[PDB]
Amino acid sequence: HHAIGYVWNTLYGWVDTGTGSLAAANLTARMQPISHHLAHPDTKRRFHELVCASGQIEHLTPIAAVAATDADILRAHSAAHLENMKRVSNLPTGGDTGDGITMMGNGGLEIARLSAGGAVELTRRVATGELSAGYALVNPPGHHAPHNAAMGFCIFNNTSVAAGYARAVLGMERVAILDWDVHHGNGTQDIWWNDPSVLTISLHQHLCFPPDSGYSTERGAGNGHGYNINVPLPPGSGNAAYLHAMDQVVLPALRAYRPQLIIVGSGFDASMLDPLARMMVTADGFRQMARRTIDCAADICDGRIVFVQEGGYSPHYLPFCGLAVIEELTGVRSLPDPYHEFLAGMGGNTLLDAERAAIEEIVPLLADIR
Amino acid sequence: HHAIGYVWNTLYGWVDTGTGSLAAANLTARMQPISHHLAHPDTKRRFHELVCASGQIEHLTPIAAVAATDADILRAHSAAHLENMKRVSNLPTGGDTGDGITMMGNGGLEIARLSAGGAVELTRRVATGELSAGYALVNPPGHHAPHNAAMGFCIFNNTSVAAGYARAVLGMERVAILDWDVHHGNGTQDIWWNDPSVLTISLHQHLCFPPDSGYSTERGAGNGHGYNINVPLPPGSGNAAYLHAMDQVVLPALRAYRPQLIIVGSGFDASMLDPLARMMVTADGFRQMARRTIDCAADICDGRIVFVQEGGYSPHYLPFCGLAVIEELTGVRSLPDPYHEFLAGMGGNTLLDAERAAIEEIVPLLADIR
Amino acid sequence: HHAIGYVWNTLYGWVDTGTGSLAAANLTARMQPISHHLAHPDTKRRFHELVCASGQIEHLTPIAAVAATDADILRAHSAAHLENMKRVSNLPTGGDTGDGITMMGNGGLEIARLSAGGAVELTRRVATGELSAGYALVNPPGHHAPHNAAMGFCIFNNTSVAAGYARAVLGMERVAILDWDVHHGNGTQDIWWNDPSVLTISLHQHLCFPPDSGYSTERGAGNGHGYNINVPLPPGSGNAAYLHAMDQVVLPALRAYRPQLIIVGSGFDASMLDPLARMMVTADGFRQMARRTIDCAADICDGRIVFVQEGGYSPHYLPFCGLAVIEELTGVRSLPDPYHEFLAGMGGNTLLDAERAAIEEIVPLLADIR
Amino acid sequence: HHAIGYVWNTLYGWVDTGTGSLAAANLTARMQPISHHLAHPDTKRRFHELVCASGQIEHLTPIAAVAATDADILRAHSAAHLENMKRVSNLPTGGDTGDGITMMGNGGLEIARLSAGGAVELTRRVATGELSAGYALVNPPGHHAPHNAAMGFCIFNNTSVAAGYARAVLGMERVAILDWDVHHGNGTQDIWWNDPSVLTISLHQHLCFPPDSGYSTERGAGNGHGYNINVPLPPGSGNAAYLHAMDQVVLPALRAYRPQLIIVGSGFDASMLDPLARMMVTADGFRQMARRTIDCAADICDGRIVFVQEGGYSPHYLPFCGLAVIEELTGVRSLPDPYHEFLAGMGGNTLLDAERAAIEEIVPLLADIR
């Protein structure tokens, strides 16, 4: 069976990231206002528009997002957090979600629900066999939000809401979340820390964000011990490092675990041109990562694979990274990466000793995935 | 003596970088138009506005840019190149300067002259002793433009026009250009390739831009052999690498050479948040680099040091990198880097073996600087 | 029958309006570059996104644009004009279409075809009875482009291509084009000047654009004499003037003519907040204009009415003006105009003597519509 | 004597107008966020940059803004209002100043002081005879702010702070404020309502903003009765109406009153391309208005005239309207209005009966100015 779901909702493009760069604009600090916050929604909107203008949309089955219910959110998060998000969204303007950085407008909860709900909807339709696989191009992102908070531009942990749904509603015994956003998926790690029924894997730049998080020694606890896998990589890591990590750690971990569904936290902030990390992945790197993961799903869980958008901050280049992943799902490879030659000469295509050793640190942990 | 020159001209902020991201927008390639090209002038304008709003401007002596004459430009470039820039600027709209990327509007030559002329003016006033040092916050940048072309957003090689002026007009026997823009200063290298009277030093990310350029083996030719020094560094290099390069190579090179004037090609594209390179320098790193270089000038050439803006593409963070350099010139350290704590945990502050070895490759070349 | 067609194509939002305000940026004239040209595609894209986010899209039947063929374009335009547009679009960076203002990128002809083609495809589906009515939210606009040229941001005359198709392909004897864009539809007037089989009506601000065009004395020629109707209105005209014009001139003209299809050139540049005209129409005014025209179509041509987007330059307010028209097509009135109270106190709601007299100048021309 | 003062402060360009269009962005109302609020500071910054790039700055004497003190503000406003602005600015992310529209960031009071202070500092230097006249290009604007509130984007009433200073500190008996911003100067009217020592004149579009304000019957009270003059004009009024108003009402009022200083509230929102009003004034119209008013000052108060920026919302055209006024102060007429021919054919250059009659309503009030 072949039918590829695609979720975009207009409101994903309407997320109000404010007038600051990262934190808010700040006169006393002389942080001048700017039109486009680093996380501004235009970056992901440009990905969507390229999906359409490239003609990939003709090969996709558009899937409507359905708002995550309170019950949906509560499988990933605390009632206190949900209540707090209702509270801040109910406030006449809106407010600070808690961390002095992640902000939500009046009614911004509507978009957070549609983002988590997009992941849930696609998960449902893939799990049932209506669809063979899909891509949920959601916004706001999810992977930093732990059980009890919003964090790092993330209100709810979209992939964990989807996993929680696959577990509780669809009765899946084993789900895997593979997160290749360049930042550590600390939220996802936190949510499933004590839980072996969701294998949580994060490839990331070591200590990029959050600080003091994502070490290889963070392995879960209790019955969940061994079912969280962090793959911290050095700044400057490129396609060779990322593919070595896939071949040596990620794919073996998935094969050992035998998930019934694979959810990919699909960020493109590891790209060669991203401002918010120092990695060197190209569109062709993301293509190969996607191909490998989709083929793994075909081998072990009847092709059941759901990509969910996480971060990525190059409005110029992210659309082509994203499109490459979409093309691997559809099998219609109809547009070149126009940056390919320009970026290919910059490097990242040789596995450096330091990169190899960082990856090899994780291989002995594979034996504890029962 | 203490009086610090500062050059900003309104037109530096009016450079038309077009509607593309890097190359032009391109419908057949599905490269969607965007408001801010990567090189858009707002990044450097925000630096200027911070110089003003921080109160640093009160400690600076504002210096008017004076348009570089044909004679000024001809000390760095060919008559053919100048003529070609007149031609493309004279064209009813403007056009492609030659490389399919570096574009100039009708009348855009006016800004190119004022940019090179800003560097010249400041060089004159520092060399005479009217000023002790300065910063020319110019735009468009210069260091990629070789003798016979425009390249990499550079129309004229501003620091080489300034050096050419110090040589031919002021009669200096020895000038040094230290380029710490993250990209290789191939233009500057080309211009002075056969010439020992201008020592050309470039610290850069190896093969970032241009491709196949900036190797340690590129050392000049003829009488100039030994008077070009490339310090290619690996992606991910941070403050520890950059300061080791300063201490082991740059400062010893300058001391060996005994220039009568130091010109710094001062880019901030090595910053932790730059999209166009993969380096990890913070505002505090640039501060220490500037402090070291200014102190070296004080020791060897009566404090005669002229900073000239090159690249840097983070409108968020570049202003604070720049301000740190301005503060080292003025000695008035009145504003924190508000990103300091956020970026300090990401790393780059330990000298990695690979970084150390890349730097040590250049140390044996120091003996050939007579 | 009730089924409402809606045409949006991603590329409508990708039209490259450049870096100028109206004409190009110009250094010698000191016209500083700006991110958003007055005609920037975001204004119409925001209308589309509101159609979606409001939930109106759920009550619409989305219709794919199909590229206008050469044969389609030739029913409205000269082979020389078509050839010239192919030429300018084929040029490496595109070029000037002829008038020193209307520019097209490399491949920009693709968007011009999809814009005219969107109008054609909706016309076909309404005429055939598949749909009862629709709105083609196209870009670039059309009504300034006469038979032999591009003009006023218009490459092809979309409504005249659609009328030409209804005439030649669908065999309609009588088609009406009602143009309420605030600028004179000089292109449409020119194309059908000698032709009584397309009644052309233009309500506009007198002499707003083009200059020296849109006088009441411009009435067609030969067999077409009496089948062009200009309704020039004074600056400051609001809802009362526009509705008086509809009731006294427009609707009687349509009833006299008995078209088999009504095409509306639907601009919103007559809005209270438009920079490019001085009129005072509110979303409620456009609503009433749309209601009247749709009801007229129901009375005289079996409800066959096709709206085709023309101008409008308020990204803030145009979406609400547009949405009001969409709501009158769907009959689902689910969102208020949030500017209603703010704009309603500004006036325009009383028929001034000068406005009344301007309208009454046209009423004696109604008797010559046979 | 001839020396023309000019006030620009970097922070005038840093006013955070937020992410809405006019009111804040609003998800439930489906008011999508936008990069440039209507009142965004770029419009005035572009005027400043044109003053520089045109070379007018070379003929001006740059004057540093000095922050308005509490004592300065209290000559125009209540202690409650000042205290409230301190409060809202002291709040962690700032807040709503009272009217649900006029917002101020944390520390935004700094800019409000520098704006009122810029007007004061220029007034001082002109009154004292150091300067003959000047232009204070301030932001935020002032004329809507009455004694006890912020309103219509205005935190403090800059011209009334300057008048209060001329009265109390410089001991002037009679000051005139002439406000040609297109909106009614209700704040200024309120502040001096009972006071004959400040003649307050407002030319505006009738009922544009505020609603139900600016009628000819609003004439002051007590000893101030007859010393407030409103000239409400109809939508569509252009150069002919504005110049007739100057010749019939404004200039005679000033001659009758014999002020010792004229302060002009200089908005350009009456321009032909402004989104926030429906008037037809061109740069040449503003030029003639400025020429007349400066010549009047020369005749009656030793040339003592201070222009203070109010509104204006066309980033495209406002700079040229502003430059024309600057050119009349300097007497150096070195740049054309590049929109002149394009806008001159649109009209406004004939005095319509309705415009004439609106103006003539005010002429009998001239006899009560003693």
Ligand SMILES: Cc1nn(C)c(C)c1/N=N/c1ccc(/C=C/C(=O)NO)cc1
């Ligand atoms: C802390 C802190 N303090 N300040 C002052 C600032 C400006 C801080 N940055 N927070 C950040 C910055 C970036 C991210 C990116 C997340 C992502 O891409 N996820 O996948 C998250 C949080």
Ligand SMILES: Cc1nn(C)c(C)c1/N=N/c1ccc(/C=C/C(=O)NO)cc1
């Ligand atoms: C080649 C090529 N081909 N294409 C298609 C593209 C998009 C190309 N990029 N060119 C570039 C890109 C970046 C720079 C930065 C320079 C700098 O920061 N200097 O200090 C220069 C040239």
Ligand SMILES: Cc1nn(C)c(C)c1/N=N/c1ccc(/C=C/C(=O)NO)cc1
């Ligand atoms: C001519 C000319 N010459 N110059 C110098 C300039 C600045 C010119 N304006 N061109 C324009 C300006 C506006 C429109 C609006 C069209 C619309 O809304 N259509 O319905 C069209 C052409």
Ligand SMILES: Cc1nn(C)c(C)c1/N=N/c1ccc(/C=C/C(=O)NO)cc1
């Ligand atoms: C009230 C209100 N309510 N609502 C709902 C809205 C959208 C409101 N507009 N406020 C405004 C709108 C424009 C101005 C222009 C001022 C200027 O040019 N000064 O000279 C001031 C206030």
Ligand SMILES: [K+]
């Ligand atoms: K787990």
Ligand SMILES: [K+]
């Ligand atoms: K990750």
Ligand SMILES: [K+]
């Ligand atoms: K050399």
Ligand SMILES: [K+]
């Ligand atoms: K360099």
Ligand SMILES: [K+]
């Ligand atoms: K006709």
Ligand SMILES: [K+]
């Ligand atoms: K019209």
Ligand SMILES: [K+]
């Ligand atoms: K008064």
Ligand SMILES: [K+]
């Ligand atoms: K006024």
Ligand SMILES: [Zn+2]
């Ligand atoms: Zn991320």
Ligand SMILES: [Zn+2]
């Ligand atoms: Zn660079």
Ligand SMILES: [Zn+2]
């Ligand atoms: Zn129009």
Ligand SMILES: [Zn+2]
């Ligand atoms: Zn105003």
